[PDB]
Symmetry: D2
Subunit: 428 residues, 4 copies
Amino acid sequence: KHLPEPFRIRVIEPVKRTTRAYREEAIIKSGMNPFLLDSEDVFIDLLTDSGTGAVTQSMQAAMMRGDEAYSGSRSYYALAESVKNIFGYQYTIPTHQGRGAEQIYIPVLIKKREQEKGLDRSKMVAFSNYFFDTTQGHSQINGCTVRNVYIKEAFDTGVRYDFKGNFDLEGLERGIEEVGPNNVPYIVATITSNSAGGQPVSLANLKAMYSIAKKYDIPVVMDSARFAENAYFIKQREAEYKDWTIEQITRETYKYADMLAMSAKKDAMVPMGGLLCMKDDSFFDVYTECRTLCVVQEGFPTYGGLEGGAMERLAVGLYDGMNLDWLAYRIAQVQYLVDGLEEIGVVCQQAGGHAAFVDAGKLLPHIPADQFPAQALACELYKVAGIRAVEICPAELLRLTIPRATYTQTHMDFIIEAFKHVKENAAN
Amino acid sequence: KHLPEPFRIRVIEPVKRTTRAYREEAIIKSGMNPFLLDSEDVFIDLLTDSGTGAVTQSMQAAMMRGDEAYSGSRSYYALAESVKNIFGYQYTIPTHQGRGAEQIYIPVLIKKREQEKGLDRSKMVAFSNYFFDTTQGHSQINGCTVRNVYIKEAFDTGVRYDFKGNFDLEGLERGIEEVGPNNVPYIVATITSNSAGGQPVSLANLKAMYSIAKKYDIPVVMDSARFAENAYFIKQREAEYKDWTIEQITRETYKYADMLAMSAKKDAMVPMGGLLCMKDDSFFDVYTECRTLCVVQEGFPTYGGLEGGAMERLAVGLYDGMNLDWLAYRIAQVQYLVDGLEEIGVVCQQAGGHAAFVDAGKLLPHIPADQFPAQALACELYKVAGIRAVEICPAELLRLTIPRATYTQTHMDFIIEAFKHVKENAANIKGLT
Amino acid sequence: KHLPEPFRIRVIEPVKRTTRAYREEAIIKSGMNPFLLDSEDVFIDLLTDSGTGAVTQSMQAAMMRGDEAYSGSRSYYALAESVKNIFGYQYTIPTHQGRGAEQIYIPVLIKKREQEKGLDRSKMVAFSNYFFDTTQGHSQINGCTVRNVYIKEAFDTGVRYDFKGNFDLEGLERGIEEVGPNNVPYIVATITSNSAGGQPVSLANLKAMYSIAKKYDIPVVMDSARFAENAYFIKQREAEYKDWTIEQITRETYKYADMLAMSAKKDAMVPMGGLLCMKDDSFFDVYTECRTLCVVQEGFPTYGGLEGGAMERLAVGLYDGMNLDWLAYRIAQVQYLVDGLEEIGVVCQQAGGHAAFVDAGKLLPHIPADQFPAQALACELYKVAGIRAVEICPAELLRLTIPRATYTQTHMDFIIEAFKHVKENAANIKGLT
Amino acid sequence: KHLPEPFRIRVIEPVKRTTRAYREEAIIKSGMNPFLLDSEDVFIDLLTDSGTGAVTQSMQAAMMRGDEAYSGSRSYYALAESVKNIFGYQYTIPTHQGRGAEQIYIPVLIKKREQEKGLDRSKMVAFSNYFFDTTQGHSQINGCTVRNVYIKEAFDTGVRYDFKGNFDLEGLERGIEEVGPNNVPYIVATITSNSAGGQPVSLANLKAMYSIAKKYDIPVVMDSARFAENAYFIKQREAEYKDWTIEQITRETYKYADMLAMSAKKDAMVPMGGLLCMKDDSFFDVYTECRTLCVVQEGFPTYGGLEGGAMERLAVGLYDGMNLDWLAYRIAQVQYLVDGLEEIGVVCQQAGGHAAFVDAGKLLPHIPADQFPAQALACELYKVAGIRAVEICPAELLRLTIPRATYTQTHMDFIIEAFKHVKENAAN
């Protein structure tokens, strides 16, 4: 059951269709890699949910009230105030997006422990329930090795579990020790756990993760692109919070980190925006230090690469993103897609918040090892219906990512029928 | 089969849900007349497709570039130019909406036949394939009787037919002769035919109509609210035009009127806007005359009650409304609604462009006819799913009118499921007195 | 002294320049009537402050959140609520603009006194401190004579006076008695007094007027286009109110009418919008009656010809229009214009809220009166600087009406410099016949 | 003479005023540094013209037509096409702003010459007519020393000259040699020369600069924040181009660089945006390489940190920014401010494109050496009128920077009267 949209549609961007002849030539042209296809050659564009979604009327309003002031803008304060009421975090630095909160927090947090505890850079390891590609990429650019301490269940697309994104507690505790605490610059808590497919992390797990971090005085950065979807799964699956509001769960949730880095272009539903925030005074020093570096990289920490409107809009998106009907609707669409695909013998991970991971390796096991299974299917899937999706042994899963409030159930049915044509011609 | 939207969604307005308890109070409080329910209390609002539907990004962008000049705005010129390229019509008066062009043309065209052909005001009768409520209303306010000359097939929710909107040609020809051609102030060609349930009028019919009117020198006005939908139907059903484009079909169509009066709030997709345009120099007089009256009623005829951005927006709206993928999708969503309802045994009219019309008389057969049954169905549909629909003897059909690019196949299902529950319960359903 | 704008500028519309040669052709081609010049050909457009002026960011943002529901929109409710908090008025009908509330209230209030007090339609006369063109026009279309009861000072561009807008109180009292109180359908309290050049009407005057009307049970309608400007003048000039806020002055003011009809296109700063509101339950009847007529003329009385975003926008417009820094700046820019012109020897009326009125009769003294001299001045001002101004015997004053937050002290200077060149050349200036 | 605005005003952001009492407490609070004052405490905000200006109706329209597509957006192409027609440059990479085109071009250009010609990083020097603070800052972060080869006239606020931003040709030629060509990773041509006050660079100078760069095969990056104002001065002051249109002059101008880096938040009048573009195939390799690094830092090179709308808007701002009446108006306002200030004995640099540099050192020569002359005056200037301006021996000039189409002549007169009060109480 696809829930009815708890909204009226208001502004649409028209899309043209393409001949089968035409997409063949597009797919060679951007040579066997959907990633480099032209937007206009794509009907249903599932490359990513990042910044590709609808906004609300209020968000659109918000864009028209920007204070474009270089230092100390009222729009900066409007944004910082949303962060205060939602996460209860006293310190806000806007950034243009995630890719860029990371470029700041990471060198600061390494320098910090370096000064205060003799972190040895050649020996430093950071931890996460699972590092996102950018978070990882940037950790390594700063010379920091990373380890994922996820739970045995997480990538096993064959079995179901309520919070597959959780931290392996034994593993994190032992990692920290084998490495030494002085050389762990930070732990990142990814909610939802993006890389296992948007698999959520429960409150009980976050609390216990934070007890360990506390015991060794390791900063905890909450990677919050999909903070709202995570809350919804907690409301839906964790017995103790069944009656909590999403806001209430967010506030409890964020007690178990020291700071947050967020690409706003996901759950907070903005075409553009990011946040790097600190909870309290204990981190004022880090906040000061991240301000300096934000200057160099984004621009003055009162806009941090955002125009006025963007800050006004984000200040509103953080609310609209947490709407209960909204989440229930968004999450069920994904769930409906996945259900739809399981029902025709296309094996998928457990449905997460924002995307449907098809185990491409299983759909075409005759298409061999080192011939990139998903890529091949993704190419075919584009060839048949004008559907763009990408994939980037753990698991090679093709990744149907759903922009928020963008496509309808008819589109979901459309992805389904296409897959049925692919599967039913997969002997190639 | 519901076609997939040919559009990414871009802006959404959130809607909150209500509880049966609350809706029981709302409908009492808004005296058993869905019409007077508040927006907030309504989940799916099927009251009207007038001004209730999505705009495209280009339209929204157009609202940002209005020339607010009080006389001779470029935006007015932008609007006039679309009318020329689309309908081939030389003369243009923006008005705030349909209700408002009608207020102008009606008195002017009655005055004209008074002076020119000696019209008897107290004998006068205007003709149409079927007059819309506001067109009737206004015709009547200026003292003019109205007569609908539809074909027997039109309101018959039993048989199907390619163009139920057509003018009953003999009937029109006869009425004109029976009444006196001098006392016929005008003919209104309503396209699509609203009241029949959005049924099309074919080109061939419009040619034959126009000929009758030319034979008597009767101005013909094209009521143009749903011109795009009509063209689409002409292209789907009229053999002669299968390979034409919606634009070319629209150009060809307007050869068979003398002027157009348009609620731009329907097919042109705008929250506000209307038009009053004349075709060529033969009607320069009426145009001048209509300008004078517009000043009085709407404002200087170079904005006619519209802000700059609205003229800009309509200038774009006229184009996007004609999009082939767009119309095919729109018309198809409505068809899907009708098919879903017929399939659960709810007898509808033949699916038109914009709305499913439900024979409330049939779904609820024991409800005495004089206890307005469609009203009762309406109230019931609200109590059950928070869907607003309204009815206002050819019939009393409850009218499910779909706003454009607003609701999804999921909402359609919802509306169907609700009717399935309403049908399952007809025996406890409440007449209304 | 021109105060500095209390605002950063945010969006600009570029304007191209023209050459004397080109303007010589434009004004011929648009038959020596600046009125019919195209927007594009005009550098400074001083035709009207109606709908031609800047909006604030909040207003523009408001346009993005319209509830396009056809009945009971939240935006309608947002609008009604501002009217309650601002004017203290319980009943609200959006209309597309002033022209459009007038069309409603006039017939309703004539019908009322016909039935209730036995009004003679062919004897009836409406009164005002001074009736605006469209108010006159409409009053007259429904068969009602109009009489202006201004004080001798009003049009006298010689002496100054704090409130030239005032009702000639004896005159009103007498006219009512002279005509029969039964045949007085209504009194219109126009604030500020447009035709006098935007001159204020004081609270004390409005109290004394309202008393006369209460003595005869005559509905009083507040013509409210420039209510904000009036309040500002009351605060600057009326001793009693120096320490009041514009809002409190507005609340106090509206105690002395029964209903308001407003072109929101002026002080409320919106490109489009109007209002028709009644004060309390004593006028519930008229309100109901006005609703019915609005359906017919503007549309269902819950949008009354306005899109959702317009209701949202006006809901905000009413507030921002009352800003103290805003008004002081606005009123001061006009004053600066007047002072610049008097200083180069161009005799103006006393500076009102929105416009400088230039005594074209005096600047050009040998131009025979019957060769419309203000027109000729207008045409001349266009030939010389590409400034559009218009005139439409108490006078023939050319009317330089300044759109809000649109032009700068630099444009004011420009307008002055042009008049300095026009005065320098009066002997070769062309009468017009 | 202040030219009349060649525009009607359309949307205004209201501003409140403040008591003298109140600004005293604001100025201590953000302790003796206007830079950190709250936007709402500022009436006339001249901290910078960067992203603080009006937009046109068409730009605002443009924001409503974004294609928010992650890869290959039609808005990306719309933007790249403006760059093509205006500068004639085949390669476009959007970036969120200037600060960030620099973070890319610089390491790429150093690596390039390092591979191809044995640049020695410990010996590398880059050149410019004058390096902007960010361009410099980022050159140094990558270990690159910088030298300015400006002409003797440039900072001498006492004398006037038609193109004070020009490259010292002898100096650049000799620098290159003393350093060795293999260790000059790039030359940056700043138009206008921001740091000498917006002093323009003539076409003849750019042509001859480029002949030298050619002779030694050194990449030339045109730092183009104020490309349009520069064109206008060329049209106004260089005999040979009196009759050229601004577009025509821009096209000629850009023949004398290999690539461009631009903060769009200045002449192109966008609240947000940047460009890193390459002229032709000879630089395709650099373009490819800058794409990669843009991924890491801004996001995919098809948006590069910009939302759809931003790209649409920039694609339009690059035109609207070059409008002839617009420039003549903007430049004369500055000129009018400056004139106004010279006329009351406040000594200023020659008026540039975008800002008025007051020689603070001269206005208060009793306020000593190491007590930051401008800071002190800027504090006072804020204390008196609610005017924010900042200053960051060469020259210590307080820097009144005018946002585009934001303030009116009455505001200019207002800055003037304030300065008259400051000057006339400067014995403190």
